[PDB]
């Protein structure tokens, strides 16, 4: 035991390893693995065929639009004008309140990233018999603000970059959309649910019919045209942020309308029960926990002067169980700085107590204390299912 | 074919490659795997004691899979605002794009601060996930099977909340499979049920019921990331998305 | 080039594809689409018992589905969500005769477990003046994925690699389908750990990308037929055929 | 021209160079960049819960820029004495001298001691600063957009207040720009708004509302320094100064 008298290192604690970092950085762990040198392995038939990469995903077409193309489209006719950003779109005509959308793989892999740049590629499969013949422009106009999105026609389109194509025998091509913008990268068209900071697209694609289709009588008047999107050779994305897209695995959504009334967050589930600071434990009040001084707090009801209010739950199944389900309540300040909720037998007693408390009365008053539910009614004391909504009954005083 | 390109109509003069931000920000974002390892919120809960728990009872148990837990908006009265609003995430969004996976996960559970009590964490490779329903965090009730209690053989670890209240993990790949399912799972084969979750982690406090009252309705957020060894396999196209900025406003 | 000279023979060359004792022809180049790299044999890890591919009979081409594709079918309209190892058996049994009758499928009657690459050709005979386009897409273990009912649409299969069958060209769609499943072998009957979802690798499905279009007095129907080779297979676990149960009706 | 010198009328015999204190104090002060990295007070606040916050809600959000936040003396009744008295600082004073910048920042937020609760910190490169007004720390109210909540993709970090209550940061340069604006900003172009802040950091406690009462009106001071990689560009002369010792006395 030589003594080690020299001064100790002086380090600063932190509670946690970095969450953001994810590359050139060893990240220590409490492995639940047995061997400490063990690591997952891939037997030769279990080998990972797919090299996950933004480019390996971006370089896959997904059908994104399906133009119809009738014979009687005159030479000027528009077929589509989808924006020249990866977030090209095809809404599903669903019954859902919040409609789902198809995306190109580039349109999903690029939603995860704040910024993108480089060429896109729209393959066009002009589905036709070789006996169909026609010609169509597939132009690209840099710098079109949405007000200029209209006023377009194929002839203004010809002024800027475009590509004529001749449907005859070969019936497919692949226009490669240019990246023209003043910004070296380009910001996401959408965003995490936050409308400002949603820049619109750099430029717009167009596809007018330069020479109208001229079918034989024995073949169809109409030709389908599929528009596929693919990340180009130079397509690339940088900053990772919140995806602007969510999976359809669960399309439930919950509006936070303030009109319905409910206990403050973290104070539910609650059950009727005794509490020593209120009526000396003689009378019921909601509680979010068995321990002392754990009464549920409640939002202050907005009562205009000269009126009164008392609660009634929308669903009697979710009310906390006493001797009877507690569908009725009167919310009043406890004098401890928070609004306790006082369960009552019925809408009538609740209305009466409400008449008292807004009537210049107080909790200590005998006329009120008669209206409070006695402790013996506590019963099993089952908790309310979650944090159930309370409709606010209102009456003139 | 899908990736065929019949006749390119090039207009572009060649654009400078940026190396995915390597030439600007100093860091490539090319490999999507290295982004997969940024940590993500995985689940979230308010602890809810029901039965008078002993030292051994697990407080909650959740299956541990890359796909992400079935999304839990929460009850209409008390939404978990992030999943309600910031739908799903990144890692599940990319897990959407492939059909099989074979790899580790990491977790880094963040326990509530006010509590002092010790916390154990089992991993349970044995357990089968039983359909996409009940692929969610579960608040275990009264003990009736071995599911509700600490178990001897299963790999485990015990954070001391007093020293640092965020146990960090490395759930390993233990399955008798080539590689597990990765989309949502409805369980066709009875033996398909072993083919999804890496295991079935269980967190549990060692508090006696007298002290367990401090713990009630204290948040316990959870994180996860795919753990380096992860390797998704077969490509599968994205199911329809739902744009987030288009979600309804709260309305005043 | 550009010098047609049709004779009694007709004009073009006819490429073939012999296997065991079944040759079948396509005038057109197949639109091959291969979802995965070729599988490793994997009998090594899970079978002491005698293993043997039956190359001389399992690898023969044999029909599993055929269907009319009239102009009445709307844009996105499934024609056939074939399962594959099952449809090879389910179609035979649907045709009112036992699996034992058909040479391709006798080893399934016996061996408890199957593995191996598949081949699927989706031949068509649309007339040259018709306009339309099938896609043929293989989707691994579709049934396991409950949200597939939403994905199962042409926008959603066009993202993964898939064959295209233009009705103008009457193109034939080859489709190699190497084995990939969570478990290395597919059982051919009820087995101790699973029963339901028997012998179900996944599903071929042939959504329409463009409905047939034609002159009002033109040829309405367009028949399609789907052959399936079962090549680099291997069977293991010999077992009595009385245990075998007829495949789920689908 | 500005730096021209037509005809020097030297009287001086040469003075010994000191190397900017290198010859005395042992350290050069020549490079102003290395002084820029001494940390400075950046903002300051008393936490103010309004709505009944959930685990996910951000407690406050501020844009993160070298220019310094718009100076906040505070209300006439309750001045923040340092900004009232010690006007601005060093780093903003030198940020006054240049017109563009391109670099990192560091922060080292100092949370209140009495609170135990875990604390997360988002960085949000997406957000545009919207004029010099509302370039200040903001106490977010009820959730209505995604602005008010934790988000999945955005880079983040989670200090455990119990272990050490000062998360330290490295806000990086993520903009699709050559280099950002550096003086005060009134937003001419709509796309000029992406050209200022590095991002828009958001700090948020994970406390349930029952515990959030401990947190109210507890100070949270913030620091910043330019982070080594910073490089201001075009020279621009100083706007008029206001001498500090000449500021009025409190008057007894
Ligand atoms: O707190 C300290 C720091 C350094 N050192 C010693 O100083 C020396 C230089 O440390 P570094 O690795 O540069 C080395 O011998 C250390 O052990 C201490 O003993 N205590």
Residue of C nearest to B240 (CA): C151
Helix (H, G, I), strand (E, B) or coil at B128: coil
Sheet holding C118-124, edge to edge: C63-67, C224-229, C118-124, C176-177
Which of A6, A11, A12 should be mutated for ligand 1, with most atoms under 8 A from CB? Answer: A6
CA–CA dist B175, B182 (Å, integer): 14
Q: Tokens in use for A273?
A: 């029960």
d(CA D237, CA C158): 59
- CB under 8 Å to D236, separation ≥6 — which residues? D97, D98, D99, D183
3-state secondary structure string, chain C?
A: CCCCCCECCECCCCECCCCCCCCCCECCCCCCCCCCCCCCCCCCCCCCCCECCCHHHHCCCCEEEEECCCCCCCCCCCCCCCECHHHHHHHHHHCCCCHHHCCCCHHHHHCCEEECCEEEEEEECCCCCCEEEEEEEEEECHHHCCCHHHHCCHHHHCCCCCEEEECCCCCCECCEECCCCCCCCEECCCCCCCCCCCCCCEEEECCEEEEEECCCCCCCCCCEEEEEECCCCEEECCCCHHHCCCCCCC
- Could you tell me which residues come within 8 angstroms of residue D16 by beta carbon, excluding any fewer than 6 positions away? D23
Interrupted backbone of chain C, residues before each interruption (C–N > 2.5 Å): none
Q: Which of B85, B89, B166 sits opposite D143 (nearest CB)?
A: B85
End-to-end Cα separation, chain B, in angstroms: 51
Whether residue D147 and residue A194 make contact (CB cut-off 8 A), yes or no, is: yes
Chain mean position to CA B187:
19
Rounded to a whole number of angstroms, the distance from the CA of D164 to the nearest CA of chain B is 10
Q: What are phi and psi for residue A136, nearest 5 degrees?
A: -145, 140
3-state class of D139 per DSSP?
A: coil
Pairing label, strands A134-137, A164-167? antiparallel
First to last CA, chain A: 85
- Separation CA C25–CA B177 (nearest Å): 39
Range of the domain at B24: 1-252
Cβ A11 under 6 angstroms from ligand 1: no
Rg (CA), chain B: 21
Interface test with B, best of A157, A254, A292, A296 (most B CBs within 10 A): A254
Q: Cβ(A216)–Cβ(A128) under 8 Å?
A: no
What's B16's DSSP letter? P
Task: Tell me which residues of chain B, numbers 173 to 212, contact chain D at a CB-CB cutoff of 8 Å.
Answer: none
Is A70 in contact with A78 (CB distance < 8 Å)?
Answer: no
Give the Cβ contact number of residue A112 at 10 Å.
25
Q: Using CA positions, which residue lies closest to atom 10 of ligand 1?
A: A9
* H helix or E strand, kind and range, residue B134: none
The span from the CA of D235 to the CA of D241, in Å, is 17
Please tell me the total count of domains within chain D.
1
Distance CA C43, CA C184 (A): 9
Residues C54, C57, C60, C66, CA torsion sign = negative
Angle (CA) D44-A14-D230 rounded to 5° is 60
Cα end-to-end distance, chain D, whole Å: 51
DSSP D77-130: TS--HHHHHS-S-SHHHHHTTBSEE---BB---B--SS----EEEE--TTPPP-
Asked if D125 has any chain A CB less than 8 Å from its own CB, the reply is: yes
Q: Across chain B, which distance is largest between two alpha carbons, in Å?
A: 75
| CB-CB contact of A317 with A385 (8 Å) | yes
- In chain C, the N- to C-terminal Cα span, in Å, equals 49
Report which of A234, A128, A110 is spatially closest to residue A173, judged by C-alpha positions. A128
Check if the beta carbon of residue D141 is closer than 8 Å to that of residue D50: yes
Buried b / exposed e along A46-66 (16+ C-beta atoms within 10 A)? bebebebbbbbbbbbbbbbbb
Query: Other CB atoms closer than 10 Å to residue B157's CB: what's the count?
Result: 17
| Residue pair A136/A209 in contact by the 8 Å Cβ criterion | yes
**DSSP letters spanning A318-339:** SSPBSSSB--EEEEEE-SSSSE
Residue C140 CB neighbours (<10 A): 23
3-state secondary structure of A67: strand
Bridge partners, B156 (sequence order)? B122
Q: With contact defined as beta carbons under 8 Å apart, do B78 and A385 qualify?
A: no
Measure A67 CA to nearest chain D CA, in Å: 33
Q: Tokens 């009328």 identify what position? A: D9
| Residue tagged 């591919």 (tokens) | C53
- CA A9 to ligand 1: nearest atom: 1
Cα angle, residue A130 at apex, residues A127 and A135 outer, rounded to 5°: 70
Domain with C100, as residue range(s), is 1-250
Nearest alpha-carbon partner for A220 in C220, C130, C171: C130
Q: Give partners of C (≥3 CB pairs < 8 A).
A: A, B
Dihedral angle sign, alpha carbons of residues B171, B177, B179, B183:
negative
Residues A248, C147 contacting (CB under 8 angstroms): yes
- Residue where the block lists tokens 């970059």: A161
CA distance B9 to A205: 14
∠ Cα B218 B223 B228 (to 5°): 160
C93: nearest Cα among C108, C114, C81 = C108
Contact B191 C194 (CB under 8 A): yes
Buried b (16+ CB within 10 A) or exposed e, B167-199: bbbbbbbbbebbbbbbbbbbbbbbbbbbbbbbb
Q: β-strand C224-229 against C63-67: which pairing, if any? A: antiparallel
CB contact under 8 A, A256 and D53: no
Residue B153: enclosing H or E segment and its boundaries?
Answer: none
Distance of CA B219 to the CA centre of its chain: 16
D179 touches D102 (CB < 8 A) = yes
Query: Residue with structure tokens 């008798």?
Result: B176
**Cβ contact D101:D180 at 8 Å:** yes
Distance CA B176, CA C45 (A): 11
Q: What is the DSSP letter of A16?
A: S
User: What resolution in angstroms, rounded to 1 decimal?
Assistant: 3.5
Q: Among D118, D151, D160, whose Cβ lies nearest the Cβ of B86?
A: D151
Instruction: Give the separation between CA C97 and CA C75, rounded to whole angstroms.
Output: 35
DSSP symbols for B64-83:
--TT-PPP----TTS--HHH
State both tokens at C192. Answer: 């101790």
Assign residue B217 a region (left: φ > 0; alpha: ψ between -120 and 50; beta: otherwise).
left
C149, HSE (Cβ side, Cα atoms, 13 Å)? 5
Q: For residues A178 and A161, is the Cβ–Cβ distance under 8 A? A: yes
* Tokens standing for residue A87: 């977030």
Please give the Cα distance from C226 to C88 (Å, whole number): 10
Q: Domain-by-domain residue ranges, chain A?
A: 1-251, 252-397
- What is the rounded CA–CA span in Å between residue D228 and residue D214? 37
**CA D169/CA C69 separation, integer angstroms:** 63
Question: Residue C128: left if φ>0, alpha if ψ -120 to 50, beta else—which one?
Answer: alpha
Residue B211, SS3? helix
Total structural domains within chain C: 1
Other Cβ atoms within 10 Å of C56 Cβ, number: 11
Q: Which ligand 1 atom sits nearest the alpha carbon of residue A6?
A: 19
Q: Is A30 in the pocket of ligand 1 (CB under 6 A)?
A: no
Tokens of B238: 């994205």
User: Could you give the 3-state DSSP secondary structure of residue A45?
Assistant: helix
A7 in contact with ligand 1, CB cutoff 6 A: yes
Q: Are C249 and C95 in contact (CB under 8 A)?
A: no
Give the bridge partners for A245, in sequence order: B243
What residues contact D79, with CB distance under 8 A and at least 6 apart? D73
Task: Name the DSSP class of A7.
Answer: P
Q: Which contiguous run of DSSP H or E holds residue B224?
A: strand B222-224
D110 lies within 8 A of chain B by CB: no
Q: Do the Cβ atoms of D103 and D226 come closer than 8 Å?
A: yes
B149 CB-side CA count, 13 A: 11
């Amino acid at each position: 035991n030589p003594s080690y008298q020299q001064s100790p290192r002086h380090f600063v604690p932190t509670g946690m390893h970095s969450l953001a970092l994810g590359t050139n950085l060893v990240e220590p762990l409490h492995a639940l693995r047995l061997d400490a040198a063990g690591t997952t392995q891939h037997p030769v038939g279990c080998a990972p065929d797919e090299d996950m990469t933004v480019s390996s995903i971006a370089s896959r077409y997904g059908l994104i639009r399906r133009v119809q193309w009738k014979k009687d489209h005159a030479k000027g006719s528009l077929l589509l004008q989808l924006d020249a950003d990866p977030f090209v779109e095809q809404r599903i005509e669903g019954t859902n309140p919040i409609s789902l959308y198809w995306f190109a793989p580039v349109g999903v892999v690029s939603s995860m990233f704040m910024q993108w740049r480089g060429s896109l590629e729209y393959r066009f499969d002009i589905i036709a018999s070789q006996f169909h013949t026609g010609r169509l422009i597939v132009g690209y106009v840099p710098g079109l603000t949405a007000s200029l999105q209209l006023q377009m026609d194929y002839m203004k389109l010809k002024s800027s970059s475009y590509v004529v194509f001749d449907l005859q025998e070969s019936n497919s091509f692949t226009f490669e959309v240019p990246y023209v913008s003043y910004r070296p990268w380009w910001v996401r068209k959408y965003g995490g649910n936050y409308l400002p900071s949603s820049t619109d697209a750099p430029s717009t694609l167009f596809m007018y019919v330069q020479v109208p289709l001229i079918p034989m009588e024995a073949v169809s008047d109409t030709i389908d045209i599929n528009v596929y999107v693919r990340g180009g050779s130079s397509f690339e994305v940088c900053v990772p942020v919140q995806p602007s897209l969510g999976l359809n695995w669960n399309t439930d959504f919950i509006l936070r309308n303030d009109e319905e009334y409910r206990a403050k967050t973290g104070y539910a589930p609650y059950y009727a029960g005794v509490w020593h600071s209120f009526n000396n434990s003689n009378s019921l009040v909601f509680r979010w926990g068995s321990a002392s001084d754990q009464i549920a707090q409640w939002p202050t009801i907005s009562v205009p002067r000269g009126e009164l209010a008392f609660l009634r739950i929308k669903d009697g199944k979710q009310a906390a169980v006493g001797t009877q389900p507690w569908r009725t309540m009167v919310v009043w300040p406890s004098g401890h700085g928070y609004n306790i909720g006082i369960p009552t037998y019925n809408a009538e007693r609740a209305r009466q107590l409400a008449q008292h408390l807004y009537g210049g009365g107080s909790l200590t008053d005998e006329k009120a204390k008669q209206l409070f539910v006695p402790a013996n009614q506590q019963g099993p004391g089952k908790v309310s299912n979650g944090n159930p909504v309370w409709e606010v009954m209102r009456a003139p005083l | 074919e899908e990736s065929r390109n019949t006749t390119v109509l090039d207009t572009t003069t060649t654009l400078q490659s940026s190396g995915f931000g390597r030439a600007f920000f100093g860091e490539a974002f090319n490999d999507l795997k290295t982004l997969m390892r940024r940590y993500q919120l995985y689940g979230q809960l308010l602890l809810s004691v029901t039965t008078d728990k002993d030292i051994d009872h697990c407080m909650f148990t959740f299956p541990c899979l890359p796909q992400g837990l079935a999304l839990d908006i929460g009850s209409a009265g008390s939404p978990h605002e992030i999943f309600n609003r910031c739908r799903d995430g990144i890692i599940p969004l990319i897990a959407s794009g492939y059909r099989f996976y074979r790899g580790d996960l990491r977790y880094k559970i963040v326990f509530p601060s006010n509590v002092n009590s010790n916390i154990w964490v089992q991993h349970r490779p044995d357990r089968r996930l039983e359909g996409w329903s009940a692929a969610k965090i579960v608040n275990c009730d009264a003990v009736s099977t071995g599911q509700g209690v600490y178990n001897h053989g299963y790999a485990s670890h015990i954070q001391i909340t007093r020293v640092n209240n965020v146990i960090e993990l490395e759930v390993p790949f233990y399955n008798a499979t080539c590689y597990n399912y990765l989309q949502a799972f409805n369980a066709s084969s009875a033996a398909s049920s072993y083919a999804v979750s890496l295991g079935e982690i269980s967190v549990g406090f060692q508090a006696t019921s007298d002290d367990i009252a401090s713990i009630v309705n204290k948040p316990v957020t959870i994180y996860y990331s795919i753990g380096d060894g992860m390797q998704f396999s077969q490509w599968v196209g994205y199911q329809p998305m739902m744009i987030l900025d288009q979600l309804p406003a709260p309305v005043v | 080039m550009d010098n047609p000279n049709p004779g009694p023979d007709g004009e073009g060359e006819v490429e073939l594809e012999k296997d065991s004792n079944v040759v079948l022809t396509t005038q057109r180049d197949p639109s091959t689409s291969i979802p995965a790299p070729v599988s490793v044999k994997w009998s090594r890890w899970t079978s002491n018992d005698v293993v043997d591919d039956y190359a001389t009979i399992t690898s023969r081409w044999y029909q599993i589905a055929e269907f009319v594709w009239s102009k009445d079918d709307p844009f996105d309209k499934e024609l056939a969500r074939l399962i594959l190892p099952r449809a090879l058996l389910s179609s035979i049994e649907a045709n009112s005769d036992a699996i034992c009758d058909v040479p391709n499928t006798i080893p399934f009657k016996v061996h408890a477990y199957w593995r191996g690459d598949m081949e699927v050709r989706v031949q068509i005979n649309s007339n040259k003046f018709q306009v339309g386009q099938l896609q043929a897409t293989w989707y691994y273990s579709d049934h396991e994925n409950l949200n597939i009912s939403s994905k199962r649409s042409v926008y959603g299969f066009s993202q993964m690699d898939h064959a295209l069958i233009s009705a103008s060209a009457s193109n034939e769609a080859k489709l190699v389908i190497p084995f990939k499943h969570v478990y290395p072998f597919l059982p051919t009957r009820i087995v101790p750990d699973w029963t339901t979802g028997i012998l179900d690798m996944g599903a071929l499905n042939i959504r329409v990308i463009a409905p047939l279009r034609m002159s009002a007095t033109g040829p309405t129907t367009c028949n399609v037929v789907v052959f399936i080779k079962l090549n680099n297979s291997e069977f293991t676990g010999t077992s009595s055929g009385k245990f075998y149960a007829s495949q789920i009706r689908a």
